[PDB]
Design a protein around this ligand. Structure first.
Ligand SMILES: [Mg+2]
Ligand SMILES: [Mg+2]
Ligand SMILES: [Mg+2]
Ligand SMILES: [Mg+2]
Ligand SMILES: [Mg+2]
Ligand SMILES: [Mg+2]
Ligand SMILES: [Mg+2]
Ligand SMILES: [Mg+2]
Ligand SMILES: [Mg+2]
Ligand SMILES: [Mg+2]
Ligand SMILES: [Mg+2]
Ligand SMILES: [Mg+2]
Ligand SMILES: [Mg+2]
Ligand SMILES: [Mg+2]
Ligand SMILES: [Mg+2]
Ligand SMILES: [Mg+2]
Ligand SMILES: [Mg+2]
Ligand SMILES: [Mg+2]
Ligand SMILES: [Mg+2]
Ligand SMILES: [Mg+2]
Ligand SMILES: [Mg+2]
Ligand SMILES: [Mg+2]
Ligand SMILES: [Mg+2]
Ligand SMILES: [Mg+2]
Ligand SMILES: [Mg+2]
Ligand SMILES: [Mg+2]
Ligand SMILES: [Mg+2]
Ligand SMILES: [Mg+2]
Ligand SMILES: [Mg+2]
Ligand SMILES: [Mg+2]
Ligand SMILES: [Mg+2]
Ligand SMILES: [Mg+2]
Ligand SMILES: [Mg+2]
Ligand SMILES: [Mg+2]
Lengths: 116, 70, 101, 87
RNA sequence: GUGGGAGAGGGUGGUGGAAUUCCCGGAGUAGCGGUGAAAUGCGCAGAUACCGGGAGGAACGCCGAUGGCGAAGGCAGCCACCUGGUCCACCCGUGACGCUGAGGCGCGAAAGCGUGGGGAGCAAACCGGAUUAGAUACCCGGGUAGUCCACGCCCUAAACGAUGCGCGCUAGGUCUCUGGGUCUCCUGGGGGCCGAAGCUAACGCGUUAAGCGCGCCGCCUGGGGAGUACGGCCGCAAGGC
């Protein structure tokens, strides 16, 4: 109901799922989506199609909130991570800039056994 | 595709205070560029490192940045 | 006694009374720890690469000094006590190694 | 550490004759200086082991040169020892 | 001796950013997580994702290497202090002062033990979910000792170059680290790879010897029994020699 005009788009990609959050310029979320948000349940969520449909869901939900100009933030390596962005190209939203912010440490923490 | 020092002046490697030159040795991100792209030598690169890090502590140089395009 | 460089970065928004105050305290500490000042370069307002204490900029001071070695760390400890002082880095003075020259 | 002032002080104190840097006497003196230094550094920093090895080395050398000296002329040995107050 | 050099060599105190977890606030809904696929788990007491703030522990990305240092174990953010080893140049000083080293003494990854702190992440045991003919395992969700610090013990190992230390001698080529030089190059000192002579059962070693010699120490004498038994010593114990 805010009619938020221009905003930020965050894409969090993993190998188990891909989820999207759309927010206002100071960062507070407007709407969001994910592979579970749509029909998919199991591993199907980590698929690229899921990513597309997700990004699109968030996109429409943004349209209804009066969204037009969008900046993108991408975090993580995952399947369909790219496909998400590809969906936001055809979103019907103008994509100003794409940025990869994926957090990586300077090696603070011992990772899980799976990860070393 | 010339290496850093190749296009560059005559400069103090031990000077942490001078950003103008040092920034050129960093990457698109805040990463410190490898020898392959810095055109330096062992001793050179090794001094540049500690110098950069010094700067970083002083907030003159980025610990890290964010990538664009992608 | 040896030659060192004191690097001080403090809050950029200081009133002149406040500035002169903090610099006065600095000078005081220096005299008190037995450091003679060979020369000084004050570059003041500068844009940090990352925010330090919630703020994007900082006020910069550079001192070349000579002083007793044993007192140095104490001198840093003392210089950091001030709230307004965000960064203190003391280095040993070194000859200018060059390159591409 | 050990500055050059202190160095020369010791050397010119222990020289057998002007311009003598390397006499057995001098060597043992210099040794002894570094020894006392290091050991005072090990009164604190008890956990510094590597330095302690270094000190073992130094001690060994000193005791060796003294053994020589006292083998050649026992008088100079007595002199030196009593002057430094050692073994 | 003097004059220069490189370095994650050691000890102490500071200190910086990235991330994880937790807590506070904003905004925001229906799931997140996770796997081969799943479930336990967490979520309407508002999670996941996003923004700001705070707390705390541990480890220091890029630089980083096929690199450097150390006697070995081992040593990586940055700063300062204390300190060890080592290399080169000058040819200045002492004048064989040398090499090895049974005992002894000290150091000695990790796990483990004691007392007292600390505890984010990880994680023996353990609690669960799966898989399977069964699962006491691999995979998944949790989780204690521990991993961290101080002090004192333990004294083991693929503690590996599976190659004891020192010295002299015997083609080179190539890459490299670090000094000096009259600086396509030469000369020292480290790190690799090829290869002369030679060695070797062979693979391979080959101026970083496993070659040609000399000195000194350790050690071996078929496999299993067995690093077990007895005895001794050390240890709080585990256990070690
Ligand atoms: Mg899934
Ligand atoms: Mg302060
Ligand atoms: Mg060090
Ligand atoms: Mg240290
Ligand atoms: Mg909350
Ligand atoms: Mg519930
Ligand atoms: Mg439930
Ligand atoms: Mg409940
Ligand atoms: Mg806590
Ligand atoms: Mg690496
Ligand atoms: Mg090793
Ligand atoms: Mg040194
Ligand atoms: Mg001579
Ligand atoms: Mg003579
Ligand atoms: Mg020996
Ligand atoms: Mg041990
Ligand atoms: Mg341990
Ligand atoms: Mg304990
Ligand atoms: Mg865990
Ligand atoms: Mg587990
Ligand atoms: Mg032999
Ligand atoms: Mg040269
Ligand atoms: Mg070595
Ligand atoms: Mg060589
Ligand atoms: Mg042959
Ligand atoms: Mg060979
Ligand atoms: Mg030999
Ligand atoms: Mg052989
Ligand atoms: Mg038998
Ligand atoms: Mg045994
Ligand atoms: Mg018997
Ligand atoms: Mg027994
Ligand atoms: Mg007993
Ligand atoms: Mg056993």
């Amino acid at each position: 109901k805010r009619q938020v005009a221009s905003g930020r788009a965050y894409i969090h990609a993993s190998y188990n799922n891909t989820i999207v959050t759309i927010t206002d310029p100071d960062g507070n979320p407007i709407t969001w989506s994910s592979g579970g948000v749509i029909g998919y349940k199991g591993s199907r969520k980590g698929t690229p199609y899921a990513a597309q449909l997700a990004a699109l869901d968030a996109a429409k939900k943004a349209m209804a909130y009066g969204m037009q100009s969008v900046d993108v933030i991408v975090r993580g390596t995952g399947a369909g991570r790219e496909q998400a962005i590809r969906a936001l190209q055809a979103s019907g939203l103008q994509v100003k800039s794409i940025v990869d912010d994926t957090p990586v440490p300077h090696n603070g923490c011992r990772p899980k056994k799976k990860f070393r | 595709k010339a290496k850093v020092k190749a296009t560059l002046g005559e400069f103090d490697l031990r000077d942490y205070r001078n950003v103008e030159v040092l920034k050129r040795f960093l990457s698109e991100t805040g990463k410190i560029l490898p020898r392959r792209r810095t055109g330096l030598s062992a001793k050179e690169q090794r001094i540049l490192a500690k110098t950069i890090k010094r700067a970083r502590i002083l907030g003159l140089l980025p610990f890290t940045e964010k990538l664009v395009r992608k | 006694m040896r030659r060192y460089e004191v690097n001080i970065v403090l809050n950029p928004n200081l009133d002149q009374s406040q500035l002169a105050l903090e610099k006065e305290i600095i000078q005081r500490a220096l005299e008190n720890y037995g450091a003679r000042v060979e020369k000084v370069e004050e570059l003041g307002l500068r844009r940090l690469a990352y925010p330090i204490a919630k703020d994007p900029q900082g006020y910069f001071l550079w001192y070349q000094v000579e002083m007793p070695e044993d007192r140095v760390n104490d001198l840093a400890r003392e210089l950091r006590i001030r709230d307004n002082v965000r960064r203190v880095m003391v280095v040993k003075s070194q000859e200018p190694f060059l390159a591409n020259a | 550490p050990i500055t050059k002032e202190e160095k020369q002080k010791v050397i010119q104190e222990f020289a057998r004759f002007p311009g003598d840097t390397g006499s057995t006497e001098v060597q043992v003196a210099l040794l002894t200086l570094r020894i006392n230094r290091l050991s005072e550094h090990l009164k604190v920093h008890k956990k510094d082991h590597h330095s302690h090895r270094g000190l073992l080395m130094m001690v060994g050398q000193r005791r060796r040169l003294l053994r020589y000296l006292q083998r050649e002329d026992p008088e100079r040995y007595r002199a030196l020892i009593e002057k430094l107050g050692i073994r």
